[PDB]
From Swiss-Prot:
It comes from Mus musculus. It catalyses: N-acetylneuraminate 9-phosphate + H2O = N-acetylneuraminate + phosphate; N-glycoloylneuraminate 9-phosphate + H2O = N-glycoloylneuraminate + phosphate. The keyword Signal does not apply. This is N-acylneuraminate-9-phosphatase. GO terms for molecular function: N-acylneuraminate-9-phosphatase activity. The keyword Metal-binding applies. Mg(2+) binds at D15, D17, D188. InterPro entries: HAD-like_hydrolase, HAD-like_sf, HAD-SF_hydro_IA, HAD-SF_hydro_IA_CTE7, HAD_sf. Its cofactor is Mg(2+).
Amino acid sequence: HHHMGLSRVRAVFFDLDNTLIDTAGASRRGMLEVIKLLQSKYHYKEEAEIICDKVQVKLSKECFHCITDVRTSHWEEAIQETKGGADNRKLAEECYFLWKSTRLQHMILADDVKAMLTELRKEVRLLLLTNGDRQTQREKIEACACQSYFDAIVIGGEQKEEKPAPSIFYHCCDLLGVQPGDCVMVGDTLETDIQGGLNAGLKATVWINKSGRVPLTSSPMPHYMVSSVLELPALLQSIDCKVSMS
Ligand SMILES: [Cl-]
Ligand code: NA
């Protein structure tokens, strides 16, 4: 009956945010543009940063479920908490849409990532697996124009559950006509991407960790850790050489 053999990767699932695009940095540039607006146009002082930081936290505390309203309100609340006064929706909308336009303008696929994705697609299925609200993620995808690189795109806000729930990963596999055991997840977040891949029994999880710092407490343990998605082909190539029982 049984024998040694190889088992090639058939599909790679990629995060979008902070994996393929610099969401973190694009977002800092947005906040810098809002600070510039508030300081020059509205003569804010160090309050400008306080407000932006407040909104960063508020953003980070959103729950998975009308995003423009929600996000404009973050701004409204943050301005009111800092500056007092009645609600200022027009200033909040100015800030919000400036943060939003700026960050989207700065979301781009690097040329070397384009070339890597193009090359990889010859050999494996590529799927974009991205958590977040449908509108927001779609706007990101359109801004960095990455749709043409992927066999499929799955957005968590369009599904019953998102990462790390294993169901979304099984949906990805079904879309591609592959098994979880054939798929590699690549992403920069332990609690969603990595745990999610572990939950779903994926062939491997690859943690993108630019800094290289590892946590000190219990956490999901990825199979691999790399600085950049550009290190992925070698890993895949090496996975494709691993011997296991038939
Ligand atoms: Cl976001
Ligand atoms: Na991410």
